[PDB]
CSV table of C-alpha atoms in Angstrom, one decimal:
chain,number,residue,atom,x,y,z
A,22,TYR,CA,0.0,0.0,0.0
A,23,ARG,CA,2.4,2.7,-1.3
A,24,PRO,CA,1.1,6.3,-0.7
A,25,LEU,CA,1.3,8.8,-3.5
A,26,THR,CA,0.6,12.5,-4.0
A,27,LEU,CA,-1.1,13.7,-7.1
A,28,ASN,CA,-0.9,17.1,-8.7
A,29,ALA,CA,-4.7,17.4,-9.2
A,30,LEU,CA,-6.3,19.7,-11.7
A,31,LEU,CA,-9.9,20.6,-12.5
A,32,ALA,CA,-9.8,21.3,-16.3
A,40,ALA,CA,-5.2,25.5,-14.3
A,41,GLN,CA,-3.4,25.4,-11.0
A,42,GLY,CA,-2.5,22.0,-9.4
A,43,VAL,CA,-3.4,20.9,-5.8
A,44,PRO,CA,-1.8,18.0,-3.8
A,45,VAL,CA,-4.1,15.0,-3.3
A,46,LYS,CA,-3.0,12.1,-1.0
A,47,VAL,CA,-3.9,8.7,-2.5
A,48,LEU,CA,-2.8,5.0,-2.3
A,49,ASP,CA,-1.3,3.1,-5.3
A,50,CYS,CA,-4.0,0.4,-4.7
A,51,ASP,CA,-6.9,2.8,-4.9
A,52,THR,CA,-9.2,2.1,-7.9
A,53,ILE,CA,-9.7,4.9,-10.3
A,54,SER,CA,-13.1,5.5,-8.6
A,55,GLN,CA,-11.5,5.7,-5.2
A,56,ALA,CA,-8.8,8.1,-6.4
A,57,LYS,CA,-11.3,10.3,-8.2
A,58,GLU,CA,-13.3,10.8,-4.9
A,59,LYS,CA,-10.2,11.9,-3.1
A,60,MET,CA,-9.4,14.3,-5.9
A,61,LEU,CA,-13.0,15.7,-5.9
A,62,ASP,CA,-12.7,16.3,-2.1
A,63,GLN,CA,-9.8,18.6,-2.6
A,64,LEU,CA,-10.8,20.2,-5.8
A,65,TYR,CA,-14.3,21.2,-4.7
A,66,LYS,CA,-13.5,22.2,-1.1
A,67,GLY,CA,-14.0,25.9,-2.0
A,68,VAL,CA,-16.9,25.4,-4.4
A,69,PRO,CA,-20.5,25.9,-3.2
A,70,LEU,CA,-22.7,22.8,-3.0
A,71,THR,CA,-24.9,24.0,-5.8
A,72,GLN,CA,-22.0,24.5,-8.2
A,73,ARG,CA,-20.3,21.2,-7.8
A,74,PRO,CA,-20.8,18.9,-10.9
A,75,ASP,CA,-22.0,15.3,-10.6
A,76,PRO,CA,-18.8,13.2,-10.5
A,77,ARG,CA,-20.1,11.0,-13.3
A,78,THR,CA,-19.8,13.9,-15.8
A,79,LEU,CA,-16.0,14.0,-15.2
A,80,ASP,CA,-13.2,11.7,-16.5
A,81,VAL,CA,-9.8,11.1,-14.9
A,82,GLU,CA,-7.0,12.2,-17.2
A,83,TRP,CA,-3.4,11.4,-16.5
A,84,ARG,CA,-1.1,13.9,-18.2
A,85,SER,CA,2.2,12.0,-18.1
A,86,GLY,CA,5.5,13.9,-18.2
A,87,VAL,CA,6.8,12.5,-21.4
A,88,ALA,CA,4.3,10.2,-23.0
A,89,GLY,CA,1.0,12.0,-23.5
A,90,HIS,CA,-2.4,12.0,-21.8
A,91,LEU,CA,-4.5,8.9,-20.9
A,92,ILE,CA,-8.1,8.6,-19.6
A,93,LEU,CA,-8.1,6.2,-16.6
A,94,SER,CA,-11.1,4.2,-15.5
A,95,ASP,CA,-12.0,1.1,-13.3
A,96,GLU,CA,-12.6,-1.0,-16.5
A,97,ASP,CA,-11.1,-0.6,-19.9
A,98,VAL,CA,-9.3,-2.6,-22.7
A,99,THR,CA,-6.2,-2.7,-20.3
A,100,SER,CA,-7.9,-4.4,-17.3
A,101,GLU,CA,-6.3,-7.7,-16.1
A,102,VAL,CA,-8.6,-10.6,-17.0
A,103,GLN,CA,-8.2,-14.3,-16.0
A,104,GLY,CA,-10.8,-16.5,-17.6
A,105,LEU,CA,-14.2,-15.4,-16.0
A,106,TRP,CA,-12.3,-13.1,-13.5
A,107,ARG,CA,-11.5,-9.3,-14.0
A,108,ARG,CA,-9.5,-6.9,-11.8
A,109,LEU,CA,-10.7,-3.3,-11.1
A,110,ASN,CA,-8.0,-0.9,-12.4
A,111,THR,CA,-5.9,0.9,-9.8
A,112,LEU,CA,-3.3,3.7,-10.0
A,113,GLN,CA,-0.5,1.0,-9.7
A,114,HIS,CA,-2.1,-0.9,-12.6
A,115,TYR,CA,-1.6,2.0,-14.9
A,116,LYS,CA,1.8,2.7,-13.3
A,117,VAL,CA,0.9,6.2,-12.0
A,118,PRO,CA,4.0,7.6,-10.3
A,119,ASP,CA,4.2,9.7,-7.1
A,120,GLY,CA,3.7,13.4,-8.1
A,121,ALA,CA,1.8,12.6,-11.3
A,122,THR,CA,-0.3,15.4,-12.8
A,123,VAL,CA,-3.9,14.2,-13.1
A,124,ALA,CA,-6.9,16.3,-14.3
A,125,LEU,CA,-10.6,15.9,-13.9
A,126,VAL,CA,-12.0,16.7,-17.4
A,127,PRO,CA,-15.4,16.9,-19.0
A,128,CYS,CA,-16.6,13.4,-19.6
B,22,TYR,CA,-16.7,-28.2,-17.0
B,23,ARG,CA,-19.4,-30.7,-16.1
B,24,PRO,CA,-22.2,-31.1,-18.8
B,25,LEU,CA,-25.8,-30.4,-17.6
B,26,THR,CA,-29.2,-30.8,-19.1
B,27,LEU,CA,-31.7,-28.3,-18.0
B,28,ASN,CA,-35.5,-28.6,-18.1
B,29,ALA,CA,-36.3,-25.3,-19.9
B,30,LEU,CA,-39.7,-23.5,-20.1
B,31,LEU,CA,-41.2,-20.2,-21.1
B,32,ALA,CA,-43.0,-18.5,-18.1
B,33,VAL,CA,-45.9,-17.1,-20.2
B,34,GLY,CA,-48.3,-19.1,-22.5
B,35,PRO,CA,-50.6,-22.0,-21.6
B,40,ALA,CA,-44.0,-31.9,-18.4
B,41,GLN,CA,-43.9,-28.8,-20.7
B,42,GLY,CA,-40.1,-28.4,-20.4
B,43,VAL,CA,-37.6,-29.2,-23.2
B,44,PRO,CA,-34.1,-30.5,-22.6
B,45,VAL,CA,-31.2,-28.0,-23.0
B,46,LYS,CA,-27.6,-29.3,-22.9
B,47,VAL,CA,-25.4,-26.7,-21.3
B,48,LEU,CA,-22.0,-26.6,-19.5
B,49,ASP,CA,-21.9,-25.7,-15.8
B,50,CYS,CA,-19.1,-23.1,-16.7
B,51,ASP,CA,-21.5,-21.3,-19.1
B,52,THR,CA,-22.3,-17.8,-18.1
B,53,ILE,CA,-26.0,-17.0,-17.5
B,54,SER,CA,-25.9,-15.1,-20.9
B,55,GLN,CA,-24.5,-18.2,-22.6
B,56,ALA,CA,-27.0,-20.5,-20.9
B,57,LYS,CA,-29.9,-18.2,-22.0
B,58,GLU,CA,-28.7,-18.2,-25.6
B,59,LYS,CA,-28.7,-22.1,-25.6
B,60,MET,CA,-32.1,-22.2,-24.0
B,61,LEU,CA,-33.6,-19.8,-26.6
B,62,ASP,CA,-32.2,-21.8,-29.5
B,63,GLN,CA,-33.7,-25.0,-28.2
B,64,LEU,CA,-37.1,-23.5,-27.1
B,65,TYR,CA,-37.5,-21.5,-30.3
B,66,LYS,CA,-36.1,-24.1,-32.7
B,67,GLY,CA,-37.9,-23.7,-36.1
B,68,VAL,CA,-39.1,-20.1,-35.3
B,69,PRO,CA,-37.5,-17.4,-37.5
B,70,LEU,CA,-35.3,-14.7,-35.9
B,71,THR,CA,-38.0,-12.1,-36.7
B,72,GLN,CA,-40.5,-14.0,-34.5
B,73,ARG,CA,-38.2,-14.5,-31.5
B,74,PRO,CA,-38.2,-12.2,-28.5
B,75,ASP,CA,-35.2,-9.9,-27.9
B,76,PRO,CA,-33.0,-11.9,-25.3
B,77,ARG,CA,-32.5,-8.7,-23.3
B,78,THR,CA,-36.3,-8.7,-22.6
B,79,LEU,CA,-36.0,-12.1,-20.7
B,80,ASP,CA,-34.7,-13.1,-17.3
B,81,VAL,CA,-33.5,-16.5,-16.4
B,82,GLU,CA,-35.5,-18.0,-13.5
B,83,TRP,CA,-34.2,-21.0,-11.7
B,84,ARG,CA,-37.2,-22.7,-10.0
B,85,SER,CA,-35.6,-24.4,-7.1
B,86,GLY,CA,-37.6,-25.9,-4.2
B,87,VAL,CA,-34.4,-25.4,-2.1
B,88,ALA,CA,-33.0,-22.0,-3.1
B,89,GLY,CA,-36.3,-20.5,-4.2
B,90,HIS,CA,-37.3,-19.1,-7.6
B,91,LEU,CA,-34.2,-17.1,-8.4
B,92,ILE,CA,-33.4,-14.7,-11.1
B,93,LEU,CA,-29.9,-15.6,-12.4
B,94,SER,CA,-27.6,-12.9,-14.0
B,95,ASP,CA,-24.0,-12.7,-15.1
B,96,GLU,CA,-23.4,-10.1,-12.4
B,97,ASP,CA,-25.3,-9.6,-9.1
B,98,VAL,CA,-24.9,-9.3,-5.3
B,99,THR,CA,-23.8,-12.9,-5.1
B,100,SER,CA,-20.9,-12.6,-7.6
B,101,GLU,CA,-17.7,-14.0,-6.2
B,102,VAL,CA,-15.1,-11.4,-5.2
B,103,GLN,CA,-11.4,-11.7,-4.2
B,104,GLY,CA,-9.8,-8.3,-3.4
B,105,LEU,CA,-10.2,-6.2,-6.6
B,106,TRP,CA,-11.1,-9.3,-8.7
B,107,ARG,CA,-14.7,-10.2,-9.5
B,108,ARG,CA,-15.9,-13.3,-11.3
B,109,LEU,CA,-18.8,-13.5,-13.9
B,110,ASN,CA,-21.6,-15.8,-12.7
B,111,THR,CA,-22.1,-19.2,-14.2
B,112,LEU,CA,-24.5,-22.0,-13.6
B,113,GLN,CA,-21.8,-23.6,-11.4
B,114,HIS,CA,-21.6,-20.3,-9.4
B,115,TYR,CA,-25.3,-20.8,-8.4
B,116,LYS,CA,-24.9,-24.6,-8.0
B,117,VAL,CA,-27.7,-25.3,-10.4
B,118,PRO,CA,-28.1,-29.0,-10.4
B,119,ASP,CA,-28.4,-31.4,-13.4
B,120,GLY,CA,-32.1,-31.6,-14.5
B,121,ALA,CA,-33.0,-28.2,-12.9
B,122,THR,CA,-36.2,-26.5,-14.2
B,123,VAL,CA,-35.3,-23.1,-15.6
B,124,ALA,CA,-37.8,-20.7,-17.1
B,125,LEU,CA,-37.5,-17.7,-19.3
B,126,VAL,CA,-39.5,-14.8,-17.8
B,127,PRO,CA,-40.6,-11.6,-19.7
B,128,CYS,CA,-38.5,-8.9,-18.1
């Protein structure tokens, strides 16, 4: 259970967000929302489902992260929920919440 | 990987069951497809119900009349891993009566 800190954006300026590398994308997204909306009135906060999680990697472009996609580990009838470690998200990664 | 034969019925309309060979490792979706193809043998595609409009009902005197699905509250979990439900998951026995119910 390695902790990480994300540089979270709502898409200009990044905010630190404490997460674990074994958090699912859903779990990490909650934690990001908690920091990013802290100063936003209740009535102005979007529904989380209208946002996607976008990892803007340093050197290799942007990627939408989700709990289930073409990358998910499958073994016969079994499937693993995608985590931050699954995607190889490093400590200090810039991650944006973007219109879905 | 045990073969099973189900006693398959339609739940609407007026011993009535027809035999359907399945595998116990078939998903509910897969079992449903095999049940429709036997029950509706001879009936053109255009005269068959959309499969998504039917639920699979296992009429057990022991477990109850259960609606079976590929994914539900009973699905096996292990950490972050979830398994699709099969006939073996529900422990549907050989010769089980299973109905297709308008859904």
